[PDB]
Each structure stands twice: as C-alpha cells, then as structure tokens.
Amino acid sequence: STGSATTTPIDSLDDAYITPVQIGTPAQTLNLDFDTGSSDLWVFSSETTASEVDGQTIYTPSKSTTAKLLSGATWSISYGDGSSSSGDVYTDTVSVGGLTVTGQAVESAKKVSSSFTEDSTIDGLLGLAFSTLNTVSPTQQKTFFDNAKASLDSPVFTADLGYHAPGTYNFGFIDTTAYTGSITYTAVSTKQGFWEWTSTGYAVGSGTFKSTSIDGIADTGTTLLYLPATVVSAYWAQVSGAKSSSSVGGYVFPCSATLPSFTFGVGSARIVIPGDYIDFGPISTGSSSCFGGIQSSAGIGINIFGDVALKAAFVVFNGATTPTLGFASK
Numbered sequence: 001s002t003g004s005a006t007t008t009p010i011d012s013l014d015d016a017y018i019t020p021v022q023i024g025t026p027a028q029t030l031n032l033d034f035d036t037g038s039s040d041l042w043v044f045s046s047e048t049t050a051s052e053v054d055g056q057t058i059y060t061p062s063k064s065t066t067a068k069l070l071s072g073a074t075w076s077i078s079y080g081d082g083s084s085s086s087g088d089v090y091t092d093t094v095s096v097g098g099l100t101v102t103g104q105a106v107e108s109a110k111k112v113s114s115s116f117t118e119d120s121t122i123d124g125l126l127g128l129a130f131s132t133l134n135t136v137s138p139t140q141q142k143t144f145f146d147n148a149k150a151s152l153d154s155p156v157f158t159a160d161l162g163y164h165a166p167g168t169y170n171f172g173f174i175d176t177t178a179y180t181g182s183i184t185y186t187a188v189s190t191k192q193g194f195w196e197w198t199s200t201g202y203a204v205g206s207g208t209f210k211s212t213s214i215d216g217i218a219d220t221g222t223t224l225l226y227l228p229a230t231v232v233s234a235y236w237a238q239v240s241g242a243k244s245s246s247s248v249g250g251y252v253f254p255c256s257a258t259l260p261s262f263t264f265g266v267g268s269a270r271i272v273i274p275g276d277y278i279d280f281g282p283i284s285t286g287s288s289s290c291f292g293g294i295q296s297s298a299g300i301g302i303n304i305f306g307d308v309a310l311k312a313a314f315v316v317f318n319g320a321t322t323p324t325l326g327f328a329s330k
Contacts, residue, residue: 001099001100001148001151001152001153001172002098002099002152002153002170002171002172002173003095003096003097003098003099003148003169003170003171003172004097004098004168004169004170004171005019005020005021005096005097005168005169006019006020006097006166006167006168007019007034007161007162007166007167007168007169008166009162009164009165009166010119010121010122011121012164012281013280013281014161014162014163014164014223014307014311015223016033016119016121016122016221016223016307017033017034017161017167017220017307018031018032018033018121018122018123019031019032019033019034019096019126019169020032021094021095021096021126022093022094022095022096023043023059023064023092023093023094023106024059024061024063024064024065024066024067024092024093025064025065025066025092025093026064027095028057028059028060028063028064029057030043030044030057030058030059030123030124031057031121031122031123032122032123032124032125032126033122033124033125033126033221034125034126034128034159034169034220034221035125035126035127035128035129035219035220035221036128036129036159036194036195036217036218036219036220036221036317037080037129037194037217037219037220037221037222037304038077038079038125038127038129038133038221039127039128039129039130039131039132039133039134039135039143039193040075040077040107040125040127040134040135040136041094041104041105041106041107041124041125041126041127041143041144042075042077042085042087042106042107042108042109042124042125043058043059043106043107043108043109043123043124044056044057044058044059044109044112044116044123044124045058045059045060045061045087045108045109046058046059046060046061046062046108047087047088047108047109047110048087048108048109048110048111048112049110049111049112052111052112052116052117053117054117054118054120055120055121056120056122056123056124057123058123059106059108059123059124061090061092061106061108064092066092066093066102067090067091067092067106068090068091068092069088069089069090070088070089070090070091070105070136070139070141072138073088073089073105073136073137073138073139073141074086074087074088074089074136074137075087075088075089075107075135075136075137076135077135079221080222080300080304081115081222082113082115083113083115083116084111084112084113085109085111085112085113085116086109086110086111087107087108087109087110087111088107088108088110089105089106089107089108089136089141090105090106090108091103091104091105091106092104092106094106094144096126096144096169096171097169097170097171099148099152099171099172101144101147101148103147104144104147105134105136105141105142107136107141109124125221126144127143127144128143128144128145128157128220128317129143129193129194129195130143130146130190130193130194130195131143131146132190132193133193133194145157145171145317145319146319148171148172149319151172152171152172153172153173154172154173154174155172155318155319155320156171156172156173156174156316156317156318156319156320157169157170157171157172157317157319158170158174158175158178158314158315158316158317159220159310159314159315159317160175160178160179160314160315160330161220161307161310161311162311163274163276163277163311163312167311174316178314178330179313179314179328179329179330180328180329180330181328181329182269182328183314183316183326183327183328184266184267184268184269184326184327184328185267185316185318185324185325185326186198186266186267186324186325186326186327187324188318188323188324188325190323192217192302194217194218194219194302195217195218195219195317195323195325196215196216196217197215197216197217197218197325198213198214198215198216199213199214199215199216199264199265199266199305200212200213200265200266200267200268201213201214201264201265202214202227202231202262202263202264202265203262203263203270204234204235204238204260204261204262204263205238205260205261205262205275206260207238209263209265209270210234211265214227214228214231214264214303215302215303216297216302216303216304216305217302217303217304217305218305218310218315218317218325219304219305219306219310220306220307220310221306222304222306222307223280223293223306223307223308224280224293224294224295224304224306224307224308225262225273225278225293225294225295225304225305225306225308225309226295226296226297226300226302226303226304226306227294227295227296227297227303228296228297228298228303229296229297229298232251232294232295232296235260235262235294236251236253236292236294238260239253239254239257239259239260240254240257241253241254241257242254242257242292244296248283248289248291250291250292250295250296251291251292251294251295251296252283252289252290252291252292253289253290253292254288254289254290255281255282255287255288255289255290256288257290258275259275259276259278259279260275261273261274261275262275262278262294264305264309266327269327271309271312271313271327271329272312272329273308273309273312274312277293277308277311277312278292278293278294278308279292279293280292280293293308294308312329313327313328313329313330314327314328314329314330315327316328
C-alpha cells in the first residue's frame with residue numbers, strides 16, 4: 001500500500017503545515033500537524049475542555065462506529081516550545097492520503113495549553129518520530145507510520161514541504177519526479193527517539209564551506225532552524241544590522257535587508273536554503289525589525305533541522321530495520 005496527502009502552510013510565514021487526516025467511521029476529517037519530532041497522534045475532541053477549544057475541528061468518538069476506548073490509557077506531552085496537552089485514548093481507523101490503519105491509537109485531548117487553543121487551524125498532531133517516545137501509559141502505543149509499515153510497498157515516508165506553498169507527505173514510496181539530482185542518504189541514531197543525524201558542515205551565502213559535524217534532528221514540527229551559536233553568529237554577521245535580542249527572543253534583522261542563503265551538508269552533498277526562507281517577517285505588526293529563521297540551539301540541548309531547512313529539500317524518512325535519512329535538492 002501507499003498514501004499521498006497534500007500538506008498546506010497554516011499562514012503566510014509557513015509557521016506550520018497541516019495535512020488532512022480521516023479518523024473514524026464515517027470519516028471525521030481533521031487537519032493535523034505532522035511532526036517527525038514527536039510520537040503521539042492526538043486530537044482536539046468532544047472531550048476537550050470547552051474553554052480551550054477556539055475554532056478547531058473536533059473528533060467525536062461517540063459518532064464513530066469503529067472507535068473503542070483504550071481502557072485505562074492516558075497520555076500527557078510537553079513540547080520543546082513549552083506547549084502541552086493531555087487526555088485519554090481511543091483506538092480507531094485512521095487514513096492519510098488513501099493509506100488506512102485500523103486500531104490506531106487516537107489520543108483524545110482533555111486539556112491543551114494556550115498556544116494550541118489560540119491556533120484555530122491545527123486540530124491536533126500526528127507524530128512520526130520513533131514509537132519509543134510515545135507518551136501513552138501504562139501501555140505505550142505505536143505511531144501511524146509504525147502501524148502502517150509492514151503494509152507499505154517500501155517502509156518509508158517522505159516530506160516535501162513547500163515555501164509559501166503546499167507540499168506533500170508520501171507513505172510507502174519515493175516519488176522520483178519530486179526532486180532533482182540524486183538522494184543522498186545519511187546515518188540515523190534512534191537512541192533519543194528522534195530522526196537524529198549528523199550534518200557535514202555549512203556555508204553562508206557564497207562563502208566557503210566549513211566542514212564540521214553538526215548533530216541534529218529532522219523535525220517537521222519545528223518551524224525554524226536551530227544550530228550552534230557559533231554557526232548562527234557566522235550567518236547573522238553577514239546581515240547588516242542583525243543582532244540577537246533577548247527581549248524578542250532571538251536574532252532579528254532590518255526588514256530592509258537582503259538575506260544570504262544558508263547551505264548545509266549531507267555527506268558530500270549540499271542543500272541550499274535561499275535567503276527568503278529565513279525571513280519570518282516583522283516581530284510585531286508594522287515593525288521594521290524582522291525575525292530570523294536561523295536561531296541558536298544553545299539552551300535547547302539539541303540542534304533542530306526544522307521546516308526552514310527541510311522545506312529546501314526532498315526528505316526521505318527510511319524506516320528500514322536500520323533507519324536512515326535521505327536528502328535531495330528540488
């Protein structure tokens with residue numbers, strides 16, 4: 001089997017991407033944030049505290065003839081950005097782009113933090129990191145990909161995120177028309193439950209490539225690119241007037257600037273992030289100070305290849321017995 005679904009930016013900055021997901025019988029379609037940095041599939045639901053729902057589409061398990069309470073199971077998750085959610089668990093039929101999993105754990109939110117409430121466009125998350133991170137207790141549950149894997153033509157999914165435009169998540173096959181040149185594959189460590197890999201270095205604009213190992217995670221659920229302070233300082237030093245602002249919470253730059261590109265290494269290959277991808281617009285409406293899309297990972301504890309990086313590539317998440325990651329230009 002295979003699946004193929006379009007993923008769409010939630011706003012004009014590509015702050016996140018939503019992908020339609022069919023849950024239950026008859027189908028209830030929710031727009032979920034596919035997140036390769038976590039491993040819970042959770043949804044706004046009929047059980048979500050009413051004051052914490054503001055425009056989201058909810059899953060109502062009582063209206064699904066295939067929903068079954070997973071007795072005794074609860075979940076609770078906290079994300080790197082400080083947001084959180086928790087609730088109980090149903091199993092139900094879940095389909096993504098024509099690919100169907102029966103008996104998928106659908107984690108029903110009883111509580112969500114304010115950032116989720118305030119984002120009416122995201123109806124929940126669909127985790128695509130390794131199932132070892134799944135938060136369901138007392139019986140850990142498998143991700144959608146884990147459950148689908150054996151049925152897939154090939155045990156892979158791919159992320160093809162658009163810049164200010166829709167893109168695609170494919171399951172079970174590699175679309176050879178979706179990228180240019182060849183795919184370069186690189187080793188993955190699953191020791192932290194992430195799609196963790198080591199970049200071979202970077203360049204700023206037309207500058208020379210610096211060979212240096214940068215360990216980080218491929219995370220579709222993080223907006224920006226978070227890298228060591230040395231790397232990030234080198235990038236923003238090439239933008240006149242750029243500075244790190246503690247009050248804003250990162251590097252800002254004059255909105256009048258032309259940003260340089262940023263290149264990262266995948267083995268001997270090179271992925272180029274155009275400068276425009278690194279512009280996240282005025283810090284507040286009407287401001288001439290703009291927020292940077294490359295930020296320091298210092299104090300996160302891990303480097304994160306988020307959407308800013310991933311949307312510059314066609315990315316293969318290879319879930320073979322020994323997982324690997326592939327990157328191609330496009």
